[PDB]
Write an enzyme that holds these catalytic residues in place. Structure first.
Site, mmCIF file in Angstrom:
data_model
loop_
_atom_site.group_PDB
_atom_site.id
_atom_site.type_symbol
_atom_site.label_atom_id
_atom_site.label_comp_id
_atom_site.label_asym_id
_atom_site.label_seq_id
_atom_site.Cartn_x
_atom_site.Cartn_y
_atom_site.Cartn_z
ATOM 1 N N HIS A 1 0.873 -1.143 -0.169
ATOM 2 C CA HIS A 1 -0.103 -0.068 -0.075
ATOM 3 C C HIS A 1 0.780 1.386 -0.064
ATOM 4 O O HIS A 1 0.342 2.180 -0.635
ATOM 5 C CB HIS A 1 -0.959 -0.077 1.255
ATOM 6 N N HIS B 1 6.595 7.204 5.645
ATOM 7 C CA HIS B 1 6.156 6.631 4.379
ATOM 8 C C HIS B 1 5.404 7.922 3.799
ATOM 9 O O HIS B 1 5.271 8.992 4.271
ATOM 10 C CB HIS B 1 5.185 5.508 4.290
ATOM 11 N N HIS C 1 1.957 9.273 0.839
ATOM 12 C CA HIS C 1 0.824 9.089 0.264
ATOM 13 C C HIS C 1 1.002 9.962 -1.162
ATOM 14 O O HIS C 1 1.278 10.880 -0.990
ATOM 15 C CB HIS C 1 -0.279 9.328 0.789
ATOM 16 N N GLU D 1 -3.484 13.467 1.690
ATOM 17 C CA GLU D 1 -4.628 12.986 2.633
ATOM 18 C C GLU D 1 -5.204 14.153 3.309
ATOM 19 O O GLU D 1 -6.414 14.703 2.947
ATOM 20 C CB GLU D 1 -3.788 12.012 3.736
ATOM 21 N N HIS E 1 4.482 10.991 6.029
ATOM 22 C CA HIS E 1 3.952 10.661 7.433
ATOM 23 C C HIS E 1 5.289 10.188 7.960
ATOM 24 O O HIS E 1 5.865 9.189 7.814
ATOM 25 C CB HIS E 1 2.989 9.785 7.416
ATOM 26 N N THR F 1 -4.692 6.788 8.820
ATOM 27 C CA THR F 1 -5.417 7.159 7.772
ATOM 28 C C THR F 1 -5.440 5.365 6.975
ATOM 29 O O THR F 1 -6.046 5.695 6.155
ATOM 30 C CB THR F 1 -4.709 8.148 6.852
HETATM 31 O O1 LIG Z 1 -0.479 4.452 6.780
HETATM 32 C C1 LIG Z 1 -0.168 5.221 7.339
HETATM 33 N N1 LIG Z 1 -0.431 6.564 7.499
HETATM 34 S S1 LIG Z 1 -0.336 7.329 9.155
HETATM 35 O O2 LIG Z 1 0.753 8.034 9.344
HETATM 36 O O3 LIG Z 1 -1.855 7.726 9.763
HETATM 37 C C2 LIG Z 1 0.072 5.512 9.895
HETATM 38 C C3 LIG Z 1 0.388 5.344 11.115
HETATM 39 C C4 LIG Z 1 0.488 4.243 11.635
HETATM 40 C C5 LIG Z 1 0.524 3.102 10.588
HETATM 41 C C6 LIG Z 1 0.197 3.745 9.300
HETATM 42 C C7 LIG Z 1 -0.037 4.721 8.979
HETATM 43 ZN ZN LIG Z 2 -1.142 -3.234 2.397
HETATM 44 ZN ZN LIG Z 3 0.324 7.661 6.202
#
Ligand SMILES: O=C1NS(=O)(=O)c2ccccc21
Ligand SMILES: [Zn+2]
Ligand SMILES: [Zn+2]
Ligand SMILES: [Hg+2]
Length: 256
Positions: free
Chosen positions: A61, A91, A93, A103, A116, A195
């Site tokens: 993802h 990571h 988005h 987001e 993030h 998220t």
């Molecule tokens: O995919 C994500 N976006 S986020 O920063 O809210 C987050 C926090 C913890 C684990 C996964 C994720």
């Molecule tokens: Zn996944």
């Molecule tokens: Zn995220």
């Protein structure tokens, strides 16, 4: 089998994760004219000097840059936060096009991508316990716009070829996340959630006002990643963002 497609995307998540329709979901639109300056906020402290990264992983993802969080190194403190939060991973988005991918939105504007940086409250001992607490996590969110390249991002761009498909990982040591930060630490903050499933409502969001710029070339390489695993039909990793969720009974506070 959650995802971002037509049949498994964010409008479907609530069936397996009913908290998707909860009272403090993320992301949200940041209405800049309704957010209020809060002088009760302490200065924010991002201390990433001793951060030590280990690996990068395509989890189907997004891709996570993981850190060694076994010691007190990369910490986020101050601002809205009580105590200290430890960096565990970051990571992004992003979109299929430069006009979408973030987001959070700012007066309904979508940025090209969003970074993030995920941190857990050390008072709870590990990440797993922290995500059972209403103040267990702090996510520092940073917007990306397409313009000049971000030199500190290039090492990430340049390993993506080796983790194209779901479940692939590569060694990724000595990456310095200070290179992803903008000049200003001015931010908005609000209580929210993960998220992505399981959408746990454990997060203090700290969203920086100043975007970083990345090159069209840099984000085009993000879009060459795959959601699928090796040997499967290619489904490009794009539009892995959840849209804005109802603000409900929340106030966004400005640090500036
Ligand atoms: O995919 C994500 N976006 S986020 O920063 O809210 C987050 C926090 C913890 C684990 C996964 C994720
Ligand atoms: Zn996944
Ligand atoms: Zn995220
Ligand atoms: Hg929680």
């Amino acid at each position: 089998h959650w995802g971002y497609g037509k049949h498994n995307g964010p409008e479907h998540w609530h069936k397996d994760f009913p908290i998707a329709k909860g009272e403090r979901q993320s992301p949200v639109d940041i209405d800049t004219h309704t957010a209020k300056y809060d002088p009760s906020l302490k200065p924010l402290s991002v201390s990433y000097d001793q951060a030590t990264s280990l690996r990068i992983l395509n989890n189907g993802h997004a891709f996570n840059v993981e850190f060694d969080d076994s010691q007190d190194k990369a910490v986020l403190k101050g601002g809205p936060l009580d105590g200290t939060y430890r960096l565990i991973q970051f990571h992004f988005h992003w979109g299929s096009l430069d006009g979408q991918g973030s987001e959070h939105t700012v007066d309904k504007k979508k940025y090209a991508a969003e970074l993030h940086l995920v941190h857990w409250n050390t008072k709870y001992g590990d990440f797993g316990k922290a995500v059972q607490q209403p103040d267990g996590l702090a996510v520092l969110g940073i917007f990306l716009k397409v313009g000049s390249a971000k030199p500190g991002l290039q090492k990430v761009v340049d390993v993506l070829d080796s983790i194209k498909t779901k479940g692939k990982s590569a060694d990724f040591t000595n990456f310095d996340p200070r290179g992803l930060l903008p000049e200003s630490l001015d931010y908005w903050t609000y209580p929210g959630s993960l998220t992505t499933p399981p959408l746990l409502e454990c997060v203090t969001w700290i969203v920086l006002k100043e975007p970083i710029s990345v090159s069209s070339e840099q984000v085009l390489k993000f879009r060459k990643l795959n959601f699928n695993g090796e040997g499967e039909p290619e489904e490009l990793m794009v539009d892995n963002w959840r849209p804005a969720q109802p603000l409900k009974n929340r106030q966004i506070k400005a640090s500036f």
